[PDB]
């Protein structure tokens, strides 16, 4: 700010003691003045308090390390004997340590003043007499009038001398002792910037009048608490200490003399209940009327009464109760002045002068005074707090007013600020004396800094000394579809039906060729399926609508009477496509190899025991047929016909008429049946019939994803095989891996990828450019976008790195202009800035004492465009999309053993604030930006 730099413009031309008030940042303007007095041409910082000390010797390593400097401190801890200082002072340019710690050292000569060109001592204000400030001064003195160290301090206030002329000799002769030039630091003409930093309250002191009479109450309880002193040995009577001092001694009561204190033990236990009541009674007397003082002695008397009622208790109650007669009749008078001042200075205050809403809490002396204050205002926002005290209104606090307030008030119709109010005259001369030698100090400061600087000199040296796409033609091109079975786990132990196991296969004719179309996982009840393309034939053609047709007719019946759904294509929306009518089967010859019969795809749908079965009457009754059971389909003519079954064997044992596998009806298969739905028994008249094992082929829906016993009597032979219906009912299932042709990690690393390859390529060529333009013209010249970034990061495994990503920017975007830079990129303006190289900066900013590329990553956005670099933002949304896409790319292959849904909670170092600033700071390594930063890195080094 504009005062520090007015305040270190006298330390670096010759020694000074910097005046400011407190937190005015004076430690800042020392380090202002350590770089400046470093660069034309060793510093020592001295601290009064060890609390102090460490943060001093923090802020002052922080600022030293981007210097390149040896920033060193001694507490203490590091002690040596030897010809000269140790090698934390020697090795190190700045030392900050206490002056007890060098004091030490010059009582054996060890280390001389000569070694440190300048000497920091915060608080040269105090140092005096016998401190060690003025012993090290001391020993300057001796070593003056030669080469010695260049002397600075700073603190809160000069001194306090006698008077006002008088009082200027203790500001020349402290100036003296530290050897102190005739520059003295001081707010002048940055005073009105100064006081806008740091707004300090005018202290205000209103005195009220106090009462000379009625004060005989609290005489009363005055010699009340005198008759317990005399047991007690005079313990206290109202005082403020008296109420720390009754804590100090209830503690102090246990853990002394035996039979000293064996029986002032438990008497000052009940003494000091007694009387702290008595004590907080009397305080609430002078503060507040004398009728809340009364109701408070009221209601612990009375709680003693209910208590264990001690000996000791007994007599302090009856004593109290005698006088009790006289302190009632004082609080029945009214039918205080102190608390008259305090309503009618927080009436004035709400009134006008000050904002009507706000919050302003009166400062009790102890906690009995808020809850009596309270009553008062009542009887006649605003609140009562204690604890510590609040703004503004403070009555009658005792303590020092610029420390305990500390911070601003409220205001009142008057000239003066928010301050406490007291009737005592001995908190208020208190006041006044500050004030009085506050104004004399800086009136003695001015008086002496008008003199000329010869004068000054020879005064402060003589005190030091003495719709329908066919694309093609009609043609045959037969394409054969391999489908058999490989192998599963089956826990029933069930037959395993392949479509391998039958000659007749399943053929492809259409009008498209042949694409490579490999293999596909599958599973099923009888084991895992795999459907390979090929084509076996080739160059085949039907005649006219009699092989042409025959197909068709039978894969249009094949529609509707064998998949039996409603939508095939699952509600299609745009209905069309490239066309393929039908694929046909092909039964195979002698061998292996396979021609084309079109009798098979007549026979099949002109079939009428595919699903409608007959009924058996008298005339016709079935017979037992085991080789047409074999592999024939059975169905339910009489009831309960839905879902046909396949029956795998044939039971000679087994009839309607023997056993069956229920207990329902005993020894019958077809008593079931006619005490049910009344169906005959074995069809018509037939007993014999013999029975099968009927084999249901219902599974699930979807054949993607993983997964009864009849009689032939009442049953019907199909001509349908069970294993060649099994391959054909699954052209639905498989249609998911078939239509289309060509993980989500690389979907959203393509998003800031794509983002990235604006980042790197256009942010470096133009770095002068803003942020907002460049992103203007870049936006509007262009969930699905992820998907197709993800198809370019495959493409780059097979290939360079530069080869999939450089198509990648032509294929998608256009970008005329930007996609020649997309290749590759360079540095930033910085390093086109100086043509030399980045030393030849190193003269400008002096936090230089690789460089080139470090430059512009270490710039500030706060100053616009300054003569350092071009700015931070080039480099910042660079790095953002650029490091966003690389930790993405790096964790596609560490997190592919995981799920989109469950890899998105928290991924590869997830970029949150949190630990990313945390990250740096575990390698051991404005003013509103400098405090909350500050506070927050305190609690994240836990």
């Not at 003691?17 to 004076?26: D, E, H, N, Q, R």
């Not at 009887?379 to 007013?401: E, G, Q, R, W």
Request: hydrophobic share 40%; glycine share 4%.
């Amino acid at each position: 700010r504009g005062y520090q730099l007015r305040l270190v413009d006298h330390l670096t031309k010759s020694n000074g003691i910097v005046y400011l008030p407190t937190g005015s940042g004076k430690t800042f303007v020392a380090i202002l003045v350590l770089k400046r007095f470093s660069q034309d041409f060793r510093a020592l910082f001295m601290c009064n308090t060890v609390e102090l000390a460490r943060q001093q010797a923090m802020a002052v390593r922080r600022c030293t390390n981007f210097k390149v400097g040896f920033y060193v401190g001694e507490q203490g801890v590091d002690d040596w004997t030897r010809g000269m200082w140790s090698d934390e002072i020697k090795k190190n340019q700045v030392l900050v340590g206490t002056a007890q710690v060098f004091l030490d050292m010059v009582t054996q000569t060890y280390v001389a003043l000569s070694s440190l060109s300048v000497v920091i001592i915060d608080e040269c204000h105090h140092g005096t007499g016998h401190h060690p400030f003025r012993e090290f001064m001391r020993l300057f003195t001796i070593a003056n009038q030669t080469k010695l160290p260049r002397v600075v301090g700073l603190t809160g206030v000069l001194i306090k001398g006698n008077e006002i002329t008088n009082v200027a000799t203790k500001l020349k002769e402290l100036e003296i002792t530290y050897r102190g030039n005739i520059i003295t630091v001081s707010d002048t003409k940055e005073m009105e910037n100064v006081m806008l930093y740091a707004t300090k309250p005018t202290e205000v002191m209103v005195s009220f009048p106090h009462q000379e009479q009625v004060l005989t109450v609290t005489r009363l309880i005055s010699a009340e608490i005198e008759k317990f002193y005399v047991s007690l040995d005079l313990m206290n009577i109202g005082v403020q200490p008296i109420r720390r001092s009754k804590s100090l001694q209830c503690l102090r009561d246990p853990s002394k003399k035996s039979f000293v204190k064996q029986l002032f033990n438990d008497f000052l236990y009940q003494m000091k209940e007694y009387g702290i009541y008595a004590a907080s009674i009397a305080i609430i007397s002078l503060i507040v009327e004398f009728d809340i003082k009364r109701r408070q002695a009221e209601t612990l008397s009375v709680k003693l009464m209910h208590r264990t009622a001690l000996t000791l208790c007994e007599k302090i109650r009856h004593l109290l109760v005698q006088k009790l007669q006289d302190m009632t009749y004082d609080d029945d008078d009214d039918n205080t002045p102190k608390v008259q001042r305090f309503l009618m200075s927080l009436k004035v205050s709400f009134a006008d002068k000050d904002p009507k809403d706000i919050c302003c809490l009166v400062f009790v002396e102890r906690r009995y005074t808020c809850k009596c204050i309270y009553g008062l205002l009542l009887n006649y926002n605003l609140m009562i707090c204690s604890s510590a005290c609040n703004h503004v209104f403070i009555l009658d606090p005792v303590k020092t007013f610029n420390m305990y307030v500390q911070s601003k008030g409220r205001a009142r119709t008057t000239e003066a600020k928010f301050v406490l109010f007291t009737a005592d005259k001995e908190r208020e001369k208190t006041i006044q004396q500050i004030y009085q030698y506050r104004k004399a100090h800086n009136d003695i400061a001015e008086y002496l800094k008008d003199r000329v600087l010869e004068k000054t000199e020879p005064e402060l040296y003589e005190i030091k000394g003495h719709d329908a796409l066919p694309r093609v033609g009609e043609i045959c091109y037969a394409y054969e579809i391999f489908l058999e079975p490989q192998f599963e786990s089956c826990e029933y132990t069930e037959h395993m039906y392949l479509n391998l196991q039958t000659p007749r296969n399943y053929a492809i004719l259409l009008r498209n060729k042949l694409p490579r179309l490999a293999e596909m996982p599958l599973f099923s009840n009888q084991g895992k399926l795999h459907v390979r393309v090929a084509n076996a034939p080739l160059e085949v053609i039907i005649q006219n609508s009699e092989q042409l047709e025959l197909l068709h007719q039978f894969h249009g019946m094949v529609f509707r009477d064998i998949l039996k759904i409603w939508h095939p294509f699952f509600v299609l929306d745009r209905r069309s496509k490239e066309n393929s009518y039908l694929v046909v089967p092909l039964i195979l010859g002698a061998g292996e190899q396979k021609c084309f019969d079109w009798e098979l795809m007549t026979n099949f749908r002109r079939l009428p025991q595919s699903h409608g079965s007959n009924v058996q009457q008298r005339e016709q009754q079935p017979a037992p047929r085991p080789e047409d059971f074999e592999g024939k389909i059975v169905t339910q003519w009489y009831a309960n016909y839905d879902k046909p079954m396949l029956v795998t064997k044939v039971h000679r044992e087994l009839t309607p008429l023997s056993y069956m596998e229920k207990n329902q009806q005993d020894k019958t298969y077809y008593e079931f049946t006619m005490s049910k739905y009344g169906n005959r028994i074995g069809d018509v008249v037939h007993k014999d019939k013999f029975m099968i094992e009927v084999r249901d082929l219902t599974e699930q829906l979807t054949f993607y994803v993983h997964n009864v016993i009849l009689i032939p009597e009442l049953c019907f032979n199909f001509n349908f095989p069970g294993d060649l219906w099994l391959k054909l009912i699954f052209l639905p299932s498989i249609l998911n891996r078939m239509y289309f042709l060509l993980m989500e990690r690389l979907e959203i690393l393509g998003a800031s990828f794509l983002k990235l390859s604006a980042t790197l390529y256009l942010a470096s060529k133009y770095s002068d450019w803003n942020e907002g333009t460049l992103t203007e013209v870049k936006s509007k010249l262009v969930v699905i976008a992820d998907t197709l970034e993800a198809l370019l990061g495959v493409i780059v495994k097979n290939y360079g790195l530069q080869h999939a990503f450089k198509m990648l920017e032509y294929f998608k975007i256009c970008r005329a202009d930007i996609d020649k830079p997309l290749t590759q990129l360079l540095n930033l303006e910085l390093g086109g800035k100086k043509m030399r190289a980045n030393v030849n900066t190193t003269e400008i900013d002096g936090f230089l004492i690789d460089r080139r590329y470090l430059l512009q990553a270490l710039t500030h956005p706060s100053y616009p465009t300054n003569r350092i670099t071009g700015s931070y933002q080039e480099l910042e949304f660079i790095g953002a999309a650029i490091l966003d896409f690389l930790i993405s790319a790096y964790i596609f292959e560490n997190n592919t053993k995981m799920n989109p849904g469950a890899l998105t909670d928290l991924r590869s170092a997830l970029v949150n604030n949190t630990t990313l600033a945390c990250i740096c700071v575990r390698h051991r390594l404005n003013a509103k930006l400098s405090e909350i930063i500050s506070k927050f890195v305190n609690f994240q080094e836990s």
